[PDB]
Amino acid sequence: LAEHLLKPLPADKQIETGPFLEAVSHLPPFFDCLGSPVFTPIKADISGNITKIKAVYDTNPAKFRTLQNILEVEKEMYGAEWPKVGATLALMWLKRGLRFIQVFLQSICDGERDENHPNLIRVNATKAYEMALKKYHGWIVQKIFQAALYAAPYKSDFLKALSKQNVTEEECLEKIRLFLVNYTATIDVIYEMYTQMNAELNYKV
Ligand SMILES: CCCCCCCC
Ligand SMILES: CCCCC
After folding, report:
1. CA 35, CA 158: separation in Å to the nearest integer?
2. Is residue 2 part of a domain?
């Protein structure tokens, strides 16, 4: 996780597209080791969105040099169908997935737990879901999340699995905290960009 740290934000707070995509492309493969095929569709959404942004980038790397470039170029390119199109739509959903992971990991690191059930991660996942995704899901997908939550491993197994090497839980969590610095900062900047460009949509799925 901290082997693929995101770069820091530059002074102008512009996020270069290519390095950003390389960095977040290391996140999906962790889903293969949470111990359930319930996570396969989740990996596909995140990866699928990464792939969609990459494919738009590849058609003109200079024009789409930054994430900001993408939104303003596509706004101009598409007119009325924007922002519900292209890389802008893919990144709208990617950000919510990345924020989910962010909120989840930070909750874990901050020592949040169910006193009654200390070695589960359900309360952590549930907070992340409420903060990042829930308001954009209709009742059917929300019910599916509630089912999928039971596929979550134990906290100990989860942390040990990320340490995939010979390291204490405390050490592992300090590495996660390190990863979270630039990760959170970058996602914040993407969320701010959506707000300023008025590119955020609230439709539910
Ligand atoms: C550099 C971006 C590569 C696209 C990978 C898509 C799956 C995470
Ligand atoms: C990349 C780890 C994801 C946990 C939700």
Report:
1. 9
2. no
What DSSP state is assigned to residue 135? G
Compute how many other C-beta atoms are within 10 angstroms of the C-beta atom of residue 172.
19
Tell me the structure's resolution in angstroms, rounded to a single decimal: 2.2
Q: What stretches of the chain adopt beta strand conformation (E)?
A: none
> Is residue 81 one of the residues assigned to a domain?
yes
Pocket test for ligand 1, best of 21, 43, 52, 64 (most atoms within 8 A of CB): 21
* Ligand 1 centroid to residue 23 C-alpha, Å: 9
Residue 125 falls inside a structural domain: yes
Q: How was this structure determined?
A: X-ray
Mutate to test the pocket of ligand 1, among 30, 51, 94, 98 (most ligand atoms within 8 A of CB): 51
CATH for 72 = 1.10.3520.10
Residue ranges at the known binding site? 45-52, 137, 203
DSSP 14: P
Report yes or no on 9 lying in a domain. no
Distance 83 CA to ligand 1 centre (A): 22
Number of domains the chain contains: 1
